[PDB]
Amino acid sequence: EQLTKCEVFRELKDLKGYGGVSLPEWVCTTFHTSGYDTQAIVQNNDSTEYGLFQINNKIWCKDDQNPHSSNICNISCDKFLDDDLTDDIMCVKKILDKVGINYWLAHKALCSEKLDQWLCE
Ligand SMILES: Oc1cc(O)c2c(c1)O[C@H](c1cc(O)c(O)c(O)c1)[C@H](O)C2
Structure with missing residues (x-):
């Protein structure tokens, strides 16, 4: 499935704030x-x-x-x-528990700024 931005936002609800x-x-x-x-x-x-x-x-x-x-x-x-x-x-939660968000190299490079591109109502 090719998800849209706000389908991802909705489906990832249970990750909000974790870690x-x-x-x-x-x-x-x-x-x-x-x-x-x-x-x-x-x-x-x-x-x-x-x-x-x-x-x-x-x-x-x-x-x-x-x-x-x-x-x-x-x-x-x-x-x-x-x-x-x-x-x-x-x-994902186990990854965050053990090695943290830098498992995802995109996070530091691309997702530590301009988060207003990634908002959903
Ligand atoms: O977690 C919620 C739960 C979902 O039911 C809604 C999700 C986010 O955002 C969608 C959406 C689509 C767009 O095209 C937008 O521009 C936008 O901001 C938000 C739409 O409202 C459906």
Whole structure:
């Protein structure tokens, strides 16, 4: 699913404020992470990143490329490619708990200013 900006804003409600990250910050960060494509996959021969949040199969979820992933989120990476972001968000919270927002390199570069582009009524 190719989400719109304010569909992301709505669907990410449960991340608002968690770990100090605002919802406009998440709307910006996801745009510059996956372009709002819930089916985005970025890969090389070592690792694969999945979905709206580009969660990786090195340590966060398990897949066929890396079946021995630590799988901290205790989930198949395939669950990050569907339209339901509930499990996505649960995993994002674990990422924030352990390594914080700089898992998403777009946040510092692109989403620490001009947050008024990322607002929804
Ligand atoms: O969390 C809420 C929940 C949703 O039901 C609404 C969401 C945000 O914003 C949308 C929206 C669309 C636009 O085209 C805008 O320009 C805008 O500001 C907001 C629209 O109101 C539906």
